[PDB]
Amino acid sequence: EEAELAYLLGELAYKLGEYRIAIRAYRIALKRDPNNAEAWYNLGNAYTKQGDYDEAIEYYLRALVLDPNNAEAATNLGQAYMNQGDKDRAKLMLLLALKL
Amino acid sequence: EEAELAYLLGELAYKLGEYRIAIRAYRIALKRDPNNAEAWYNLGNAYTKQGDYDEAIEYYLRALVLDPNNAEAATNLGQAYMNQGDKDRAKLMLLLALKL
Amino acid sequence: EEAELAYLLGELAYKLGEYRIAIRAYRIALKRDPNNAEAWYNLGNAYTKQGDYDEAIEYYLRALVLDPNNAEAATNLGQAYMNQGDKDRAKLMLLLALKL
Amino acid sequence: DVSALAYVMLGLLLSLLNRLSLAAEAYKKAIELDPNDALAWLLLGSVLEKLKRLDEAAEAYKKAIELKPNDASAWKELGKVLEKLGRLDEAAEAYLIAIMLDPEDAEAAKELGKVLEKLGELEMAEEAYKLAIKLDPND
Amino acid sequence: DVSALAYVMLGLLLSLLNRLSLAAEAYKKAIELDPNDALAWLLLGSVLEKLKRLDEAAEAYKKAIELKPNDASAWKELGKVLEKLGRLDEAAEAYLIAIMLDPEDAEAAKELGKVLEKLGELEMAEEAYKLAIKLDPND
Amino acid sequence: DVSALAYVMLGLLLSLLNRLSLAAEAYKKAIELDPNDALAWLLLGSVLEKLKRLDEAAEAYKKAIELKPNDASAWKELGKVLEKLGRLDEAAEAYLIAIMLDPEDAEAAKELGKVLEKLGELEMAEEAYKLAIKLDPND
Amino acid sequence: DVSALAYVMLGLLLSLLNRLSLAAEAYKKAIELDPNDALAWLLLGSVLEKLKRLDEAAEAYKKAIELKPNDASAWKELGKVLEKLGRLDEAAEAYLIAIMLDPEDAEAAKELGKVLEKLGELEMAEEAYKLAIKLDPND
Amino acid sequence: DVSALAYVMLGLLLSLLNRLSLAAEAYKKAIELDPNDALAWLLLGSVLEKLKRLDEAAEAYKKAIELKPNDASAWKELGKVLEKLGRLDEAAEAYLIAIMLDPEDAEAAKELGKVLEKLGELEMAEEAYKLAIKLDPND
Amino acid sequence: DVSALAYVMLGLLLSLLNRLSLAAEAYKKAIELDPNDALAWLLLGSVLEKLKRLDEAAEAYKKAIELKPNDASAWKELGKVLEKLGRLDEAAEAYLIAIMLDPEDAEAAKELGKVLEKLGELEMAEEAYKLAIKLDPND
């Protein structure tokens, strides 16, 4: 299904550093498959490289809720919170990453 | 709509110099969505980088007809006309670009 | 059909050295268009660069069955057999490549 | 039902007999029978144009063009109406569209030169005039 | 349905090609299929007028005006036929109604001036002529 | 259904107004409603002729001739298009067919002489010119 | 049919009046009438929890959450049940999901600190307590 | 169908158990089954304000007040919600409407005095407070 | 009904009884009942082969292969027929398809080596013969 082909395009764009395309591709994929943990995680990663740390948080949260063991998502979410200046949430999620 | 995904593939290919892939992808997109001005413009850019100035002209014209304010399309159309040696049309469309 | 879009994604991934994703893209294309000789050959090539010579052989064979004049596929299959140590089969397919 | 086109025929006859003011009404009834007819709108545009009712002719031409987007001559007539209305910029846009739909139309190039000259784009007007002359000196 | 209208086209053709005397019969056949057509009567008016059978042309114009009020063109044509018939009072009335329906028409003022000159209202005829000269530059 | 002919009538009217470019489309729709109509094809041929799409008109003329053989007028009208296209051998063949179908047509002999002279059959061209002159001394 | 909800109402009454043990059966009948009801399961969870039949309340809450994700209240109640069952790891997971659904929920932070402290994640528990205090000191 | 009403009972029951958050969603289904129910809207508006969800509560109250006019108590509650939202002028308007609908409502006068004092109409606020005291000295 | 298959059994019996020339006709009737049968065509190919009518046995095998791709033995037999027809290039191609479908069967390698020897590819023939000897010891 397109849910995989568009995700592949997103992954290829992200790997090549073309984040502007990666975000849109991941969104086109997610519109059909909202339960896709790695898709949300990569979308948050793309927004993180873009510097939109609060929106990256908004997507990392859904990445974690759908996959509570995702230690890498917790690490990046903590880093995003730190970029937002919330040292407390950032430290909590970093400790969560270490625990997971 | 898959037209969006095909256009995104075309854009990614063009940004990385894969002009064959850009042409084929944009063409796959356009036959699904002929009113897409920017797709025509990018296809013209691809054919321009290929040096196939006749095709570039033929598609830049459709790009302008669907978007008469597109100054960049006018500039590239004039450049293609100059590459074809039509100094008159080239000057006309370059002046159009400056006016727009 | 979007099979061509998937194939284009595969070609773009391969040419840019993302073999790992080229395999998945070519698979998405092939499972909807099994008669595609070029897709089989490119999948075998992707596995070859990856070093998975058994899969490369398996898909090169399917490519050659569908296109017995494919000298390039014959050369690749001979090299793959040599990598697998079947110097006899490798020599056979290399001579086939020279004949073709 | 054929009446939807019979009305177009009636309008054409009245225009041909030089009784335009009834032809406009005939075309309007035809349109109300079928709003999608390109011929009805396109002809009503010129009928209203000849009656000097430009304000309506421009809109009639636009309604026609929305139903045949790449018509190389509807744009020219709309350009003439716009030019007579004094909207010289939109007239230049229309004639540019006409040229881009058919690069070999010398008349479109000459009219675009006229509009640009009146609009003050002297250099572009001269370029367009020379191009038109090269395409055909009699147009 | 359409047969009720086709005869109007037949009459228009037979008037466009110069065979008026058959066009009148074609229009009459149209009317006997639909007495209410405001376009059949109006054209029959001018067809009978051109055949110089004025006594019927005035009647046809009047019936058309009854069927479709406020059209200044029909009133002006009826005024012309009445002028020919010598009923100058009714002609003046018709042209006055034409002015009152469209006060910007120079032609109605000119016709009213002519008719009032013939009818002996010299001052009003002169006023109408001046109004006609003021309303348009070429009449 | 009468629409198949109504479209022919619409095309004729549009040609009569000198809006040929719409008449061609009207004829094409008529044809698509009834491809065997010889009159549609012939009129479309002579319309495309005056839009100066010569080679597109030649095919319409040929299809019309195929649809009703022995049409001595269609053969000459195809010969004119072929002569303009410079395919002088086929033009000579067409004018010869015109002669065979009607040996008394002076115009056919005249234009056959013209085409033969262009084609280099000087003796035969002179013979055809003499035949044309003798057929119609009043020409 | 409305009975599927009437049974929910009956169980709600029997839980409002202190006869929980019958309310559980009423909810069970409602569920067997319509297993997809996201409210029957959610209420049955609380009713079973109050009867201290925790082993079943945990499963009831889990099925409810499966039937309607993102419910920031169901996760917290399931966390309470899990803590009372002593499976503190699953309780910590539940409260983590709760705070990640509603990051502004001070009570979720306080409960997460509670279960983390009892689970030995002293630093995380302290951080969660600070988060709870910052979000709302009154919670 | 009685289902349209049953959801209102479900919401009321859930409100009795202090599970308000489910009560609001229970009312929502009733509204989506019948948007014209004044009682559903009024109860939903009064529930939402307890969740500290004020603006939606004011919206629901106002939607209720359109569906049946003159209910002097709905206006008072919308006044309370508006006053909490800080739209003091609109709250004063609401309490004034309450006074108009029932001149003897002492609570409305007390609230009007409060809101006018907050709004800076000291004289009118004192007058309203005095009226409230005089209307109900037992208050 | 089973008639579409019965003729295949009739042909098989006749072939088994050494009555080939009627078996061919039985197979042809079966084919005319159902042209898609991959089993009729193959047996007909072998039957025509043993009647020494190779010119059509090759075509029967090719039809079977087209109707049922990706099986080695059909390619082997088509290669044999092509070999005896003297089209050694196509025979080598067919045996190569056989090897590509199954790289492990010695028979195809042996016969490919034979063809290559007769075709003049001495080195490839030696490679094929060695592969055949390695794949099985008895061939």
Structural domain for A100, as ranges: 1-100
In chain A, what residues touch B9 (CB-CB under 8 Å)?
9
In chain A, what residues touch B8 (CB-CB under 8 Å)?
9, 13, 21, 24-25, 28
> Contacts for B79-88 with beta carbons within 8 Å, 24 or more apart?
B79/B48, B80/B44, B80/B48, B80/B53, B80/B56, B81/B57, B83/B51, B83/B53, B84/B53, B84/B54, B84/B57, B88/D127, B88/D130, B88/D131, B88/D134
Is there a contact between E39 and D22 if contact means CB atoms under 8 Å apart?
Answer: yes
| Tally of domains within chain B | 1
Query: Could you say which of A61, A64, A95 has the minimum Cβ distance to residue G124?
Result: A95
User: What is the DSSP code string of chain D?
Assistant: -THHHHHHHHHHHHHHTT-HHHHHHHHHHHHHH-TT-HHHHHHHHHHHHHTT-HHHHHHHHHHHHTTSTT-TTHHHHHHHHHHHHT-HHHHHHHHHHHHHH-TT-HHHHHHHHHHHHHHT-HHHHHHHHHHHHHH-TT-
Kindly state whether B16 is in contact with chain C, defined as any CB-CB distance less than 8 angstroms: yes
Query: Could you say which of E6, E12, E73 has the minimum Cβ distance to residue D17?
Result: E12
Beta strands in chain G (DSSP E): none
Integer-rounded Cα Rg, in Å, for chain D is 16
**Structure's resolution in angstroms:** 3.7
In chain C, what residues touch I100 (CB-CB under 8 Å)?
61, 64-65, 68
Instruction: Yes or no: say if E82 and E118 are a contact pair by the CB < 8 Å rule.
Output: no
Burial environment of residue H66 by CB neighbours within 10 A (0 to 12, 13 to 18, 19 or more): exposed
Q: Nearest CA to CA, how far is C99 from chain A (Å)?
A: 39
Tokens 């003439």 belong to which residue?
D80
Instruction: Yes or no: say if C26 and C18 are a contact pair by the CB < 8 Å rule.
Output: no
Tokens 């809006």 belong to which residue?
F19
Q: Which residue of D has its CA nearest to F10?
A: D9
Position A47, amino acid: Y
Residue of C37, D31, D34 lying closest to D45 (CA atoms): D31
Kindly state whether A80 is in contact with chain G, defined as any CB-CB distance less than 8 angstroms: no
Q: Chains B/E: 3 or more C-beta pairs closer than 8 A?
A: no
- Measured at the CA of D44, the angle between CA D42 and CA D46, to 5 degrees, comes to 80
Is there a contact between A88 and G97 if contact means CB atoms under 8 Å apart?
Answer: no
Q: What is the DSSP letter of A67?
A: -
Separation of alpha carbons C45 and C32, rounded Å: 20
Which two three-digit tokens encode residue C3?
């099979």
- For A56, E94, G106, G110, the CA distances from A94, given in Å and listed in that order, are 16, 97, 19, 18
Which two three-digit tokens encode residue A87?
């040292």
Is there a contact between C96 and I134 if contact means CB atoms under 8 Å apart?
Answer: no
Separation of alpha carbons D7 and C87, rounded Å: 85
Is there a contact between C2 and A5 if contact means CB atoms under 8 Å apart?
Answer: yes
Q: Nearest CA to CA, how far is C52 from chain A (Å)?
A: 21
Position F4, amino acid: A
Instruction: Yes or no: say if D124 and D116 are a contact pair by the CB < 8 Å rule.
Output: yes
Which two three-digit tokens encode residue G101?
């659904």
Q: Which chains touch A (3 or more CB pairs under 8 A)?
A: B, C, G
Which two three-digit tokens encode residue I112?
């490919």
Which two three-digit tokens encode residue I32?
């005319």
Is there a contact between B18 and C12 if contact means CB atoms under 8 Å apart?
Answer: yes
Q: b or e along H29-63 (b: 16 or more beta carbons within 10 Å of the residue's beta carbon)?
A: bbbebeeebeebbbbbbbbbbeeeebeebbbbbbb
Q: Nearest CA to CA, how far is H14 from chain G (Å)?
A: 8
Instruction: Yes or no: say if A34 and A59 are a contact pair by the CB < 8 Å rule.
Output: no
Which two three-digit tokens encode residue F88?
């002088």
Residue of D125, G13, G131, I118 lying closest to A90 (CA atoms): G131
Instruction: Yes or no: say if D17 and E18 are a contact pair by the CB < 8 Å rule.
Output: no
> Contacts for A67-76 with beta carbons within 8 Å, 24 or more apart?
A67/A37, A67/A41, A68/G93, A68/G96, A68/G97, A69/A100, A70/A37, A70/A41, A70/A100, A71/A97, A71/A98, A71/A100, A72/A41, A72/A97, A73/A41, A73/A44, A74/A100, A76/A41, A76/A44, A76/A45, A76/A48
Is there a contact between E12 and D10 if contact means CB atoms under 8 Å apart?
Answer: yes
Q: Which chains touch G (3 or more CB pairs under 8 A)?
A: A, H
Q: Can you state the percent helix, strand and coil of chain G, rounding each to 5?
A: 80, 0, 20
Is there a contact between G128 and A61 if contact means CB atoms under 8 Å apart?
Answer: no
Kindly state whether C34 is in contact with chain I, defined as any CB-CB distance less than 8 angstroms: no
Q: Nearest CA to CA, how far is F31 from chain D (Å)?
A: 17
In chain D, what residues touch B67 (CB-CB under 8 Å)?
none
Query: Could you say which of B61, B68, B88 has the minimum Cβ distance to residue D127?
Result: B88
Q: Chains B/F: 3 or more C-beta pairs closer than 8 A?
A: no
In chain C, what residues touch B12 (CB-CB under 8 Å)?
12
Separation of alpha carbons C66 and C42, rounded Å: 13
Phi and psi angles of residue B47, each rounded to the nearest 5 degrees, phi first: -60, -30
In chain C, what residues touch I65 (CB-CB under 8 Å)?
none
Separation of alpha carbons D16 and E13, rounded Å: 10
Q: What is the DSSP letter of H69?
A: -
Kindly state whether C21 is in contact with chain A, defined as any CB-CB distance less than 8 angstroms: yes
Tokens 């995380």 belong to which residue?
G124
Q: How many beta-carbon pairs below 8 A join chains B and D?
A: 31
